[PDB]
Design a binder for this molecule. Structure first.
Ligand code: CDL
Ligand code: PC1
Ligand code: PC1
Ligand code: 3PE
Ligand code: 3PE
Ligand code: 3PE
Ligand code: 3PE
Lengths: 96, 318, 99, 139, 98, 175, 171, 83, 347, 88
């Protein structure tokens, strides 16, 4: 009985996962715009705050390569408020 | 409203644990041709209140040769984990949905031996030192079989997510698949519970007091609740592991009714064994596991890992 | 190794784990897989002396990736200047920083 | 090697006060090292005895450096020759006399001048020609 | 290098200092020996968990399984010297003078 | 407050290390490390190491240290000590926390601590990385590779632990 | 080290889907099996280009194509769709095994009004030969030049001239 | 064989415990090889997808990979459906 | 110790050390070190005497922390580099941690303090394993990471090794103690050129192992542990004492004996690297090794110390041990100097 | 958030329950070491449930029994050579 039920549950998993794979293309685009909207906000603020600092040009690279790098969250969400920082870093780890 | 939910989980068990002393002595008496407490209130229903209002007014006497820091902390963490055990229990919807609840549950179960350790040491008595010595060693020695039994059991279930237990156990009880593990699991608790024949932790008639030591009044109270709330816990842990139930999403009431009855039945069986059987001996206490339980548990675990691959019945948990 | 028995026998003993750009369970990338690919591919068949000076740009970008250090210096001074410019009351944070 | 740079940076035959104070620091620094080891391998009595042992070891080492730096530098000024290896010998071994002074032994003081002066002369040769004791791996 | 990394290595450093600062009890040194492998475990885990070195999660457990194995022999070593000297005091652990 | 949970856990880790490494009575020294093991889990858990942190709670913290508490029972000094019993242990405890306290002060002011290594005193949350883990639980599937990718590590773990039992009973054999 | 030029805020205004998870996952398979054309090459862009910034043009199309699929249901059996996705959310796992009857109702409606068949098991999990117009990047990682390897050792071995040559040893 | 069968029954009399576990380990270690389903288990394990099946650029002459998820071309796990 | 268990336990040390030289992963290097440590403790406790327990306790307490310190620089190097491959260390303080950790597993610097007593406490055969087989595993790591070690730190620790090792041997009585101090002096000799050239470190290893293993486990044949006890052996087996002097003179390194093999080749390499004060002082303190080497030969064969009447009993009997591989081992440790070009083979 | 909050409130109630009731009124070592070794070996096969979902379970299969065999083997040695039988 357990063997038959377990095989049915495996078929349930691939049924559940198949939905996720169809869902992922929309989420990838949503996160892509969300993350790049925020970095656009980040250096947009950077121009206003940092102009008196003598050679702090806005949006200086840190990596010598010109290839895109997964942005560190410390600058994505970092300039934001304290609350959304807390709900993001230890958000999945803490939600229970 | 999280704080009320925690209180709604802490209040009932304390009210249960005090009120479980009533049925324990009374059910014991009824399998001893007695009536149990029945003169204080309707059918004795007030004794739980009496003892809960007596060990809290008895003056606690600290031992002369003792450090009161250990003499106080040892009772506290003896009970505090027993209430924390109920945090990840999947009563329809568990309070905390720890994806590794079972390991978390075993972690605090291992923390219980520490309350055995300093409590025996701090009192600094010949009974206290030896009483601790046998008690903690027995509990840790039977924890290794506890770890293996789960490893065999949830291997068919999936990961250690206690919420998944209802999903896998949905057509037959898991005991019907691993009943040799069931007796392995149920009896192995009887020592960690400090319950029946594995009673050498305290030794009623020959060691006066063991795990609890002489800790009286205050320290006694939550030491009494320490391995009393725990009894309701690993009664419930077995009642969710093997003797599962059904869970309708639109009616979680049925799951609770089935869960409480099976847990209550297991608690009565604990009391059933409490006085019916004689008491083991510590040499035999270790003889039983390391020479009979451990070799048999190892093979059964070996059977329970191969079997899902024998029939392609590996779980979809991940 | 002192006696590289792995190369002679051809059996993989610990090379699978040596770097995080090798095969990983279910193709999970390391946090710095991109830079590992660049540094490793830069420095192969070059030796342990030439590569440390020649393939330095790859290492510097990579050595920043693991423990991101220079970019917090970027972030720390962002926080310092922002705090100073709000303590005396000149720069007003936009509403998008809040709800 | 901040202390070593502190000494060697001062040109020979000038700024004798700085050279002496640098000499005391180097002599002082090695005083702590030997005394800390002595307290470790051999457990002293109560702390006042321990610092008494520490004070003696530091005092001699500082004193040996102090007089050596003074005489090694003024000799270049007085003799108007800083390059000569003898400019370190005449003070390098006087430290041995200082060691004999604090230990009260003519034999150990004289023998230390025989050895320390030679080594102090050798150090001057090391800086002159380009000798290296911990040479980097070249071949 | 963030602060959370610092507090662990510094805890290792103070653990290292106390290990080799034997007081008159071998058990305490064995306890202070216990510090680093936990500090090593913690320090290793933050590095590996942060950088998503999936296969490297091996080593934290691999660190613990054998670094506790000396403690298995060390405790028996401690009870061995306490079966002939009757004491874990380290001042009597100097019979090898000559 | 909540934003400093990894920082607050890390400093409790240090004070727990200072207390037990200062060598009080061994049974008390175990407690000083037990809480350090307790707060050590929070750092691992907060970083996604749910299994590894919880694993440390079962073994070691709830495991081997029980034997340490066991060992200090029969093989104990006749007068177990306390930080009040001796003066040096009291001084060591104060020195460790003062050194820690002077250090966090340096970290909070300029975040440019250079001692030994070059540290940054910014918030603990920055080092995290952004990105979904899909359905595989990264850590959970990392150590599950013990039997798919472990290979050599498996036999050496088995052998050494097996050799862990030939050594033990041999040395405590009583000639 | 240079400029981190990134797209302005102008192009980051797409008609974002305003639905929730349950309604997203209620359709899922039908949406995946009817809007694969903008999903595949956009995801292929995500992998080949290895940079979010270069796939903004395909990023908006997939969201836009979602709307055409979504409002197509509204002109059709959306009432059975509402009953479905309002029964999925009630389960905490968002699992289909407890909403089989509404699974049928959505399927039977969409079967004839539109014709979107139910994707069989494993059909979505399939590598596809998506047609694309963009050329593959010459170096997706923007890798720089490669150091020239040291010259290769060659030449037939010759006996060591005058033997060992170590001190006085000969032969 | 007579003494060996006697010894095995000799074991079962003075102890029933470790003989049972030795039997359990004995079977559990040997059936894995004598199995018509362990091949299915690895096939089932690999069948479940955790990552997106990254599409490949269509350069023509791709025989087996499909263009639509509902195209018949490609691997089918129908063997699991009746399983 | 049951011979089957004793054979297995030595095999684990055989396996543990072999694992280090065949591992390409930093963890696996630390992996075998812990197994090797885990297996020697019962071997040292062969007689279960209180002195043996003292030696085992000292060895464990000085080696377990070194393995713990070993792991410390591994993660720090991992922290700053992210690779576990056995290569150069890309962070300075890690390797500064590394060299001290590896050395104190061995003992050259003040770290060396455990070597004298631990050798004395354990049995003579047990002393052999600690002193002729435990010096390969740490040297295996140092050979692999020799590219970038700080020359200042390594040479200073090598200086202190030969200087402290030779100096303490002069005032030693128990032949086990002279063995430890002789080993400490020679370990600095072999590791001094380690930053410069690795081939002549392994040269010293094979050369030192052969003479040390031969003259240790020949001393087992004499069944003596003190200078007076070794002195008596001239009457019983004068050939043993005569062979004892040959390896003792080889031990010092007097040409044409093969014990001058390392000392010659080391001075050649350090001179090639313009380091010339370093060898001369290195050669000078080697005279200290010869002095107690010569003193032991004085009491062994070069003179005749008084014997005992009861020792006439031993003349009627004979040894039972088959001195496995002993006779050939003196030959290739005192006469192999003309085979000097064999250095290139080790490369 | 909820995890340590639950721990905090549980500690407060337990601590109060005593305060309201305080102010108002070789063999043993040998088995323990064997426990530590077996308990430590137990940590090896704990991640087994996730390990049963790999794509090469054959290598997972045989090596998992290898740990269990060695637990059986280590028990066997500690069994026969007196060992687990307690000293007298
Ligand atoms: C470089 C150039 C030079 C080196 C070249 C390579 C040769 C190295 C060895 C030279 C000879 C050493 C020797 O024996 O001298 C005589 C000398 C005289 O000893 P003894 O007084 O007869 O006492 C010996 C035992 O104590 C007696 O104890 P017992 O009475 O209990 O008998 C046990 C004994 C006798 O054997 C048995 O009991 C047999 C066991 C059978 C059951 C197990 C079967 C399965 C395993 C089979 C293994 C074969 O077995 C062992 O001791 C086990 C270890 C040796 C066999 C396994 C070797 C590794 C594989 O030996 C010693 O002092 C001990 C030597 C131990 C082995 C060498 C360890 C150091 C090696 C350093 C160099 C390594 C290479 C570096 C490159
Ligand atoms: C293909 C098939 C695969 C699986 C097949 C598995 C084998 C067949 C089934 C075998 C039996 C089941 C497993 C073994 C169980 C017994 C283990 C054992 O050691 O037994 C002998 C042991 C006694 O063994 P012993 O001590 O006489 O001999 C052992 C060997 N020597 C002597 C060397 C040590 O039985 C017990 O210990 C009895 C229990 C003692 C504790 C007191 C409480 C008992 C309460 C009983 C009533 C309640 C039961 C509740 C059950 C659970 C409910 C949820
Ligand atoms: C001894 C019993 C255990 C080793 C033999 C049986 C298992 C072999 C195995 O897993 O090999 C894995 C590998 C060969 O790999 P493989 O081809 O079996 O599986 C590869 C699986 N992936 C791709 C996921 C990594 O071999 C080893 O690990 C050999 C280790 C040494 C064995 C001998 C020791 C003596
Ligand atoms: C050009 C730059 C430098 C300029 C300044 C010159 C150099 C620094 C000053 C001189 C340093 C070397 C001379 C020795 C200094 C230490 C002397 C010392 O410690 O004396 C105390 C004591 C002697 O007496 P003791 O052996 O204890 O016996 C009697 C006990 N009641 O001895 C002891 O307690 C210790 C044991 C004896 C001495 C051991 C060796 C100590 C010196 C090591 C080398 C130092 C080299 C310094 C210079 C080069 C490096 C910078
Ligand atoms: C490199 C450091 C090596 C340290 C070695 C320590 C052990 C051997 C030396 C020793 O014990 O003492 C050496 C030195 C001088 O000892 P001293 O204070 O003169 O006392 C002699 C009579 N007991 O006492 C010391 O403490 C000096 C040690 C460092 C010398 C440079
Ligand atoms: C399927 C085909 C095989 C079927 C089974 C055949 C073998 C049966 C073995 C039965 C037990 C061993 C033999 C025996 O009778 O041993 C008796 C003895 C009992 O000792 P004891 O009761 O303590 O008394 C001592 C004082 N007189 O025994 C002992 O003391 C030895 C006990 C050893 C226990 C080892 C347990 C290991 C873990 C369980 C087994 C796991 C699988 C191992 C591999 C099996 C491979 C086939
Ligand atoms: C490089 C520098 C020098 C190095 C070597 C220095 C060696 C001596 C150094 C001084 C030693 C201490 C003082 C003397 C100690 C004497 C030790 C001893 O045991 O003496 C007594 C002993 C008695 O002799 P016995 O053992 O009975 O054996 C007799 C021969 N069968 O005597 C013996 O045991 C001695 C046995 C000698 C055996 C000689 C065998 C000769 C073989 C000749 C083969 C010829 C082949 C010719 C081939 C021709 C064609 C090519």
């Amino acid at each position: 009985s357990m063997m038959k039920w377990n095989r049915e549950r495996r078929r349930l998993q691939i049924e559940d996962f198949e939905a996720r794979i169809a869902l992922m293309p929309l989420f990838q685009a949503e996160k892509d715009r969300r993350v790049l909207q925020m970095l656009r906000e980040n250096l947009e603020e950077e121009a206003i705050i940092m102009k008196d600092v003598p050679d702090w040009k806005v949006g200086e690279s840190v990596f010598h390569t010109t290839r895109w790098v997964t942005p560190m969250m410390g600058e994505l969400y970092g300039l934001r408020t304290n609350e959304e920082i807390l709900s993001a870093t230890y958000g999945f780890i803490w939600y229970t | 409203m999280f704080m009320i939910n925690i209180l709604s989980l802490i209040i009932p068990i304390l009210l249960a644990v005090a009120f479980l002393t009533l049925v324990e002595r009374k059910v014991l008496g009824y399998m001893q041709l007695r009536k149990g407490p029945n003169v204080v209130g309707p059918y004795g229903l007030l004794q739980p209140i009496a003892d809960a209002l007596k060990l809290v007014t008895k003056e606690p006497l600290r031992p002369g040769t003792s450090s009161i820091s250990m003499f106080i902390i040892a009772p506290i963490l003896g009970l505090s984990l027993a209430l924390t055990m109920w945090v990840p229990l999947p009563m329809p919807y568990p309070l905390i949905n720890m994806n590794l609840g079972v390991l978390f549950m075993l972690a605090m179960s291992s923390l219980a031996v520490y309350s055995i350790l300093w409590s025996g040491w701090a009192s600094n008595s010949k009974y206290a030192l030896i009483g601790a010595l046998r008690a903690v060693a027995q509990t840790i020695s039977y924890e290794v079989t506890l770890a293996i039994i789960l490893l065999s059991v949830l291997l068919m279930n999936g990961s250690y997510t206690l919420s998944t237990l209802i999903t896998t156990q949905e057509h037959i009880w898991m005991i019907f698949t691993s009943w040799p593990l069931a007796m392995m699991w149920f009896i192995s608790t009887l020592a960690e519970t400090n319950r029946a024949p594995f009673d050498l932790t305290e030794g009623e008639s020959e060691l006066v007091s063991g795990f609890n030591v002489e800790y009286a009044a205050g320290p006694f109270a939550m030491f009494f609740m320490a391995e009393y709330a725990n009894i309701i816990m690993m009664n419930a842990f077995t009642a969710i592991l093997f003797l599962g139930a059904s869970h309708d999403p639109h009616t979680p009431e049925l799951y609770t009714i089935n869960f409480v009855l099976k847990t209550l039945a297991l608690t009565i069986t604990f009391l059933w064994i409490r006085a019916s059987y004689p008491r083991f001996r510590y040499d035999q206490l270790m003889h039983l596991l390391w020479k009979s339980f451990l070799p048999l548990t190892l093979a059964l675990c070996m059977w329970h890992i191969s079997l899902p691959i024998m029939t392609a019945s590996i779980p979809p948990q991940s | 190794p002192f006696f590289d028995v792995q190369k002679r026998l051809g059996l993989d003993l610990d090379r699978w784990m040596t770097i995080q750009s090798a095969e990983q369970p279910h193709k999970i990338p390391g946090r710095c897989h991109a830079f590992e690919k660049e540094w490793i591919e830069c420095a192969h068949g070059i030796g342990g002396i030439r590569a440390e000076k020649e393939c330095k740009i790859e290492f510097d970008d990579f050595v920043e990736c693991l423990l991101r250090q220079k970019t917090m210096k970027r972030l720390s001074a962002i926080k310092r200047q922002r705090d100073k410019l709000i303590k005396e009351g000149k720069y007003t944070p936009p509403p998008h920083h809040l709800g | 090697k901040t202390l070593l740079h502190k000494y060697s940076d001062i040109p020979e035959g000038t700024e004798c006060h700085r050279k002496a104070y640098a000499s005391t620091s180097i002599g002082g620094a090695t005083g702590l090292i030997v005394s800390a080891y002595s307290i470790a391998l051999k457990p002293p009595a109560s702390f006042l005895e321990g610092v008494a042992r520490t004070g003696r070891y530091t005092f001699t080492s500082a004193a040996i450096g102090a007089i050596f730096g003074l005489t090694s530098c003024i000799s270049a000024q007085v003799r108007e020759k800083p390059d000569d290896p003898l400019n370190y010998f005449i003070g390098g071994c006087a430290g041995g006399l200082t060691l004999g002074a604090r230990t009260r032994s003519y034999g150990i003081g004289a023998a230390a001048c025989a050895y320390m002066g030679l080594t102090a002369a050798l150090v001057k040769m090391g800086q002159l020609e380009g000798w290296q004791v911990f040479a980097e791996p070249k071949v | 290098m963030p602060l959370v990394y610092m507090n662990i290595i510094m805890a290792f450093a103070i653990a290292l200092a106390g290990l080799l600062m034997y007081r008159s009890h071998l058990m305490s040194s064995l306890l202070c020996l216990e510090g680093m492998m936990l500090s090593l475990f913690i320090m290793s885990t933050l590095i590996i968990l942060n950088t998503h070195f999936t296969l490297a999660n091996m080593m934290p457990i691999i660190l613990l399984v054998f670094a506790a194995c000396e403690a298995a022999l060390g405790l028996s070593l401690l009870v061995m010297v306490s079966n002939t000297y009757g004491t874990d005091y380290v001042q009597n652990l100097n019979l090898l003078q000559c | 407050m909540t934003m400093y949970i990894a920082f607050i856990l890390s400093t409790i880790f240090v004070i727990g290390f200072v207390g037990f490494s200062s060598k009080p009575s061994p049974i008390y020294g175990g407690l000083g490390l037990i809480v350090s093991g307790g707060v050590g889990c929070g750092i691992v858990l907060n970083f996604g190491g749910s299994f590894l942190g919880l694993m440390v709670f079962l073994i070691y913290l709830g495991g081997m240290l029980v034997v340490f508490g066991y060992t200090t029972a029969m093989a104990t000094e006749m007068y177990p000590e306390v930080w009040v019993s001796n003066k040096t242990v009291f001084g060591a405890f104060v020195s460790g926390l003062m050194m820690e306290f002077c250090m966090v002060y340096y970290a909070l002011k300029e975040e440019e601590v250079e001692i030994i290594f070059k540290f940054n005193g910014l918030g603990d949350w920055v080092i995290y990385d952004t990105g979904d883990s899909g359905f595989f639980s990264e850590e959970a599937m990392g150590i599950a590779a013990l039997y798919s990718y472990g290979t050599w590590l498996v036999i050496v773990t088995g052998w050494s632990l097996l050799i862990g039992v030939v050594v033990i009973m041999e040395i405590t054999r009583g000639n | 080290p240079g400029i981190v030029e990134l797209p302005t805020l102008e192009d980051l205004k797409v008609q974002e889907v305003k639905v929730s998870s349950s309604v997203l996952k209620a359709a899922a398979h039908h949406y995946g099996a009817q809007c694969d054309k903008p999903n595949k090459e956009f995801m292929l862009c995500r992998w080949e280009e290895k940079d979010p910034r270069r796939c903004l043009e395909e990023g908006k199309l997939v969201n836009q194509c979602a709307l055409d699929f979504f409002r197509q249901i509204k002109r059709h059996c959306a009432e059975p769709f509402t009953e479905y996705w309002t029964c999925i959310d009630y389960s905490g796992l968002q699992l289909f095994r407890h909403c089989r009857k509404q699974q049928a109702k959505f399927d039977e409606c969409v079967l004839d009004k539109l014709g979107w068949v139910r994707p069989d098991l494993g059909e979505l999990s399939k590598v596809t030969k998506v047609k694309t117009d963009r050329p593959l990047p010459e170096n997706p990682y923007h890798s720089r030049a490669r150091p020239e390897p040291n010259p290769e050792a060659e030449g037939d071995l010759k006996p060591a001239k005058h033997g060992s040559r170590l001190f006085f040893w000969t032969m | 064989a007579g003494r060996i069968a006697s010894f095995l029954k000799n074991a079962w009399a003075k102890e029933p415990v470790l003989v049972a576990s030795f039997a359990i380990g004995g079977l559990a270690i040997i059936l894995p090889s004598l199995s018509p389903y362990t091949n299915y288990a690895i096939r089932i394990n690999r069948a479940t997808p955790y990552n997106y099946p990254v599409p490949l650029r269509d350069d023509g002459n791709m025989p087996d990979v499909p263009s639509h998820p509902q195209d018949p071309q490609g691997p089918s796990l129908e063997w699991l459906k009746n399983l | 110790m049951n011979p089957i268990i004793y054979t297995t336990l030595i095999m684990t040390v055989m396996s543990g050390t072999m694992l280090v030289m065949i591992s390409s992963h930093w963890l696996l290097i630390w992996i075998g070190f812990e197994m090797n440590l885990l297996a020697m403790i019962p071997v040292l406790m062969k007689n279960f005497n209180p002195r043996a327990t003292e030696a085992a306790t000292k060895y464990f307490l000085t080696q377990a922390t070194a393995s713990m310190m070993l792991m410390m620089a591994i993660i720090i190097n991992l922290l700053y580099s992210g690779q576990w491959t056995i290569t150069k260390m890309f962070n300075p303080v890690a390797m500064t941690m590394m060299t001290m950790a590896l050395a104190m597993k061995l003992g050259l610097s003040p770290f060396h303090f455990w070597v004298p007593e631990v050798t004395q406490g354990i049995s003579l055969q047990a002393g052999l394993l600690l002193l002729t087989w435990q010096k390969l595993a740490p040297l295996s790591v140092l050979c692999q990471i020799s590219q970038s070690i700080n020359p200042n730190l390594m040479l200073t620790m090598a200086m202190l090794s030969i200087l402290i090792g030779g100096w303490g041997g002069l005032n030693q009585t128990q032949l086990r103690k002279i063995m430890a101090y002789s080993s400490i002096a020679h370990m600095g000799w072999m590791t001094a050129v380690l930053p410069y050239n690795t081939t002549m470190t392994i040269l010293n290893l094979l050369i030192y192992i052969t003479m040390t293993l031969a003259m240790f486990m020949l001393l087992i044949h004499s069944s003596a542990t003190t200078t007076l006890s070794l002195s008596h052996t001239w009457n019983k087996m004068p050939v043993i004492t005569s062979l004892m002097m040959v390896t003792l003179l080889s031990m010092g390194g007097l040409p044409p004996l093969s014990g001058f093999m390392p000392k010659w080749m080391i001075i050649q390499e350090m001179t090639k690297n313009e380091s010339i004060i370093m060898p001369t002082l290195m050669a000078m303190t080697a005279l200290l090794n010869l002095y107690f080497y010569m003193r032991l030969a004085y009491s062994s064969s070069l003179t005749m110390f008084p014997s005992t009447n009861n020792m006439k009993m031993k003349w009627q009997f004979e040894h039972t041990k088959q001195m496995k591989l002993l006779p050939t081992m003196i030959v290739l440790s005192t006469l192999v100097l003309p085979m000097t070009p064999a250095l290139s083979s080790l490369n | 958030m909820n995890i340590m909050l639950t721990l905090l409130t549980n500690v407060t109630l337990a601590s109060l329950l005593v305060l309201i009731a305080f102010w108002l009124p070789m063999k043993f070592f040998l088995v323990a070491i064997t426990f530590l070794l077996f308990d430590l070996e137990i940590a090896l096969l704990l991640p087994l449930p996730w390990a049963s979902q790999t794509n090469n379970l054959k290598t997972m299969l045989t090596m998992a029994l290898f740990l269990l065999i060695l637990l059986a083997a280590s028990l066997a040695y500690e069994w026969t050579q007196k060992g687990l039988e307690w000293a007298e």
